[PDB]
Amino acid sequence: EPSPYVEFDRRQWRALRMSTPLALTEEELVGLRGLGEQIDLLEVEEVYLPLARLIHLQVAARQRLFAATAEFLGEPRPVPFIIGVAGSVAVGKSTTARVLQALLARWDHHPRVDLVTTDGFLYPNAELQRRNLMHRKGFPESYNRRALMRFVTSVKSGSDYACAPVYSHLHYDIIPGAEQVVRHPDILILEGLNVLQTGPTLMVSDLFDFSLYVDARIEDIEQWYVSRFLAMRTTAFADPESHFHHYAAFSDSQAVVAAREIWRTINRPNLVENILPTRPRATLVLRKDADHSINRLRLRKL
Amino acid sequence: EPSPYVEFDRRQWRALRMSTPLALTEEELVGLRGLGEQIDLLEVEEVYLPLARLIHLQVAARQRLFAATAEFLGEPRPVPFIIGVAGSVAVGKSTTARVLQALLARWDHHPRVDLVTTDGFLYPNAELQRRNLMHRKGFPESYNRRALMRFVTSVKSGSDYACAPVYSHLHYDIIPGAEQVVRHPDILILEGLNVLQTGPTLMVSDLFDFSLYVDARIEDIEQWYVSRFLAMRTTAFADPESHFHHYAAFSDSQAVVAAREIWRTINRPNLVENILPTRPRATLVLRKDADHSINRLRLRKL
Numbered sequence: 187e188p189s190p191y192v193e194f195d196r197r198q199w200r201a202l203r204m205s206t207p208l209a210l211t212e213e214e215l216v217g218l219r220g221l222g223e224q225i226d227l228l229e230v231e232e233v234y235l236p237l238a239r240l241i242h243l244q245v246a247a248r249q250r251l252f253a254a255t256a257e258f259l260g261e262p263r264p265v266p267f268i269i270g271v272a273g274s275v276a277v278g279k280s281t282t283a284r285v286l287q288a289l290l291a292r293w294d295h296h297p298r299v300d301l302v303t304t305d306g307f308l309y310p311n312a313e314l315q316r317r318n319l320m321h322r323k324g325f326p327e328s329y330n331r332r333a334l335m336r337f338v339t340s341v342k343s344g345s346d347y348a349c350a351p352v353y354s355h356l357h358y359d360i361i362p363g364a365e366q367v368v369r370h371p372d373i374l375i376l377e378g379l380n381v382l383q384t385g386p387t388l389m390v391s392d393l394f395d396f397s398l399y400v401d402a403r404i405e406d407i408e409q410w411y412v413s414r415f416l417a418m419r420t421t422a423f424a425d426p427e428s429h430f431h432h433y434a435a436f437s438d439s440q441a442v443v444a445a446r447e448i449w450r451t452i453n454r455p456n457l458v459e460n461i462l463p464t465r466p467r468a469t470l471v472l473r474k475d476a477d478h479s480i481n482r483l484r485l486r487k488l
Numbered sequence: 489e490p491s492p493y494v495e496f497d498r499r500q501w502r503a504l505r506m507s508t509p510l511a512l513t514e515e516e517l518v519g520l521r522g523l524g525e526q527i528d529l530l531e532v533e534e535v536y537l538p539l540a541r542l543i544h545l546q547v548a549a550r551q552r553l554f555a556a557t558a559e560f561l562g563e564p565r566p567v568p569f570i571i572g573v574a575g576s577v578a579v580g581k582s583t584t585a586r587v588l589q590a591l592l593a594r595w596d597h598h599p600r601v602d603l604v605t606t607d608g609f610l611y612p613n614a615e616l617q618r619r620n621l622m623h624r625k626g627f628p629e630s631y632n633r634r635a636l637m638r639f640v641t642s643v644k645s646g647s648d649y650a651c652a653p654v655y656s657h658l659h660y661d662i663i664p665g666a667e668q669v670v671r672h673p674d675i676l677i678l679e680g681l682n683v684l685q686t687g688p689t690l691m692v693s694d695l696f697d698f699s700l701y702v703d704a705r706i707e708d709i710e711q712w713y714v715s716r717f718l719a720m721r722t723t724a725f726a727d728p729e730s731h732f733h734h735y736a737a738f739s740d741s742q743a744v745v746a747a748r749e750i751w752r753t754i755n756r757p758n759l760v761e762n763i764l765p766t767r768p769r770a771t772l773v774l775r776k777d778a779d780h781s782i783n784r785l786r787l788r789k790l
C-alpha cells in the first residue's frame with residue numbers, strides 16, 4: 187500500500203545521522219531550552235542532527251530549481267530557503283525552532299540563519315479590542331496575515347531587507363516602534379501556530395521550502411501548559427510589570443483552575459479546529475511522548 | 489512592490505522560445521484541436537514551446553530534489569514529474585493538455601508522457617443518483633477523490649503500474665470494466681476541473697511538480713460553451729446512441745435556452761465557487777481572449 191509518508195522511530199532515525207559534527211555545547215543548549223522542556227544533548231544528536239543533515243542536502247537541490255526558472259527567463263547570493271515550524275502553544279516548537287537555528291548556522295560554510303516567530307504579527311490589543319478578538323488571541327484572524335505574507339515574500343524575492351513588528355510577552359502586546367530587521371539571510375525559519383495553513387489565496391505555507399510540525403497527545407500538551415503556567419508565577423508573572431502579575435499570588439489550585447479555563451476556551455479549540463488539521467502538509471512531524479521525549483517521526487518523501 | 493508572480497504578454501513570452509524545435513505538423517495539431525478551438529501552429533510556437541522549454545528545464549532540477557531525500561535516506565527510472573491542467577469546462581484546457589503531451593513526448597531523449605483526464609474518476613450515474621448528485625456532475629463531490637489520490641500517489645511512488653476507470657462522454661457514464669493502464673511514465677499530465685484544489689488532508693495538487701491553469705472572462709466561456717453545445721447537435725448528439733440524442737432536434741433558440749440553463753445552474757457556479765478560487769496556486773496561467781487567442785501569461789517565480 188503506497189504512501190507519500192515514511193514513519194521512523196528514534197532507533198531508525200538516529201542511524202541517519204552520518205558524520206554530522208555536534209557543534210553545540212550543553213551551556214548553549216539550555217540557553218535555548220524553554221521552561222519545562224527536557225531536551226538534552228542526546229536528543230540533539232539522535233534527532234536534530236539527522237534533521238539538520240536532511241535540511242542541508244535539500245538547500246543545495248532546492249536552489250537548482252530556482253536556477254532552472256532563471257535560466258528559462260534568460261537571467262544574468264541565492265533565493266533564501268524558508269523553513270516553517272508549527273504546533274500548539276506549550277508543545278515546545280519555540281525551542282525546536284531555536285535549536286534548529288543554532289544547528290544550521292554552524293554549518294562549516296557558515297550561512298546566515300534568521301528566525302522569526304509570528305507573534306510580532308499579532309494585531310495590537312486596541313486593534314483586537316476593536317474587532318472583538320481578545321478572547322481569540324492566537325487564532326488566525328488575530329494575525330495580520332497580509333502583513334506577514336508581504337514580509338516572507340519580500341525576503342524570498344531576494345530583497346535587501348525586511349522589517350517585522352515585535353511582540354512583548356511581558357506586556358501581552360505589540361511594542362510601539364520596535365522592529366526586527368532581516369537583511370537577506372540564506373535560511374529563514376518562521377515559527378508560529380497556523381503558519382502551515384492553506385487558503386483561497388496564496389499564503390506563507392506556499393513559500394516554505396521545508397516545514398516542521400511538533401506533535402503530541404492533546405492531554406499531554408494540556409499537562410505541559412498547566413505546569414508551565416504554574417511555574418510562570420515565579421518567573422514571568424513575578425515581574426511587577428507583567429500584564430499578568432495578578433496570577434503570581436494564585437495558589438496551586440486557583441492557578442490550575444485559571445490555566446485549565448484559558449486552555450479550554452482559547453488554546454484547545456484553536457489547536458483542534460485549526461492547527462491539528464494542518465499536520466498532514468508538514469515535511470516532517472516530530473512526535474513527542476508524555477515525558478517530552480521525541481520517539482517517532484513522519485517524513486514526506488512525496 | 490515584490491511579487492511571487494511575473495506577468496508576460498505574447499511578445500515577451502514568445503522571445504523565451506530559444507532554439508526549441510517545432511516537432512508538430514498541422515495535420516497532427518488539428519487531430520488534437522477540440523470543436524471550436526482556434527489554436528494554430530503560430531500559437532504552439534509562440535506559447536506552448538516556451539512552456540515546453542520551461543517544463544523540460546524543471547524536470548531535471550526537480551528530480552535532484554528527490555535525489556537529496558534518497559541520499560539522506562541512504563538509498564541504493566526516477567520519480568515521475570506530475571503536471572496538472574485545470575480550468576472550466578469549454579475553456580479548451582482539454583486541448584492544451586493534449587498539445588502539451590505531444591510537445592513533451594517529442595523531446596529528443598524521448599520520454600514516456602501519459603495523460604489522464606479526471607472524468608474517469610466520476611462516480612457512476614447510479615452512485616450519483618444515490619447521493620443525489622446528478623444535478624452536480626463535475627462538482628468536487630461527484631468525484632471519487634480518494635480513488636483519484638491513491639492513483640496519482642501510486643504512480644509517483646514509482647510503482648510498476650496503476651489503473652484508472654474510463655468515462656464515456658457518449659453514454660454520459662463510467663464504462664463498466666474499462667480501465668486505463670499507466671505503466672510508470674516519466675511525466676504524467678492530469679487534467680480536470682478542481683484538480684488544483686486544497687483541503688484538510690493531502691490531495692493531488694500536493695503531488696504536482698508543475699501546474700497549468702487555462703483562463704478567460706466568464707462571459708466568453710459561456711459563449712464558447714453555448715456555441716459548442718449548438719455545434720454538438722451535428723456531432724456527438726447526432727449519434728442515436730448518445731445519452732443526449734434528444735438535443736439533436738432542438739432549434740437554435742431551444743438549444744441556446746437548454747445550453748444557457750445547464751450553464752447557469754451547474755457549470756457557472758462550479759467555476760465561480762470552486763475552480764476560479766484555485767487560480768492563485770497555478771505555476772502558469774494561460775489567459776485567453778474572446779477570439780480564443782492566448783495573449784497574456786502569469787508565471788509563479790516563487
Ligand SMILES: C[C@H](NC(=O)c1ccccc1C(F)(F)F)c1nnc(SCCOc2ccc(F)cc2)n1C
Pocket residue numbers: 275276305322323324355410411412414415418430448452453
Ligand atoms: C490566549 C493567549 N495566547 C497567547 O498569549 C499566545 C498567543 C500567540 C502565541 C503564543 C501565546 C502564548 F504562548 F501563550 F504566550 C494565552 N494563552 N495562555 C495565556 S496566559 C499567559 C501565560 O502564558 C503561557 C504561555 C505558554 C505556556 F505554556 C503557559 C502559559 N494567554 C494570555
Ligand SMILES: C[C@H](NC(=O)c1ccccc1C(F)(F)F)c1nnc(SCCOc2ccc(F)cc2)n1C
Pocket residue numbers: 577578607624625626657712713714716717720732750754755
Ligand atoms: C453538468 C454536465 N457536466 C459534464 O458532463 C462534464 C463533467 C465533467 C467534465 C466534463 C463534462 C463535460 F465537458 F461537460 F462533458 C454537463 N455540462 N453540459 C452538459 S450537456 C452535454 C454537452 O456537453 C458539452 C461539453 C462541453 C461543451 F463545451 C459544451 C457541451 N452536461 C451534461
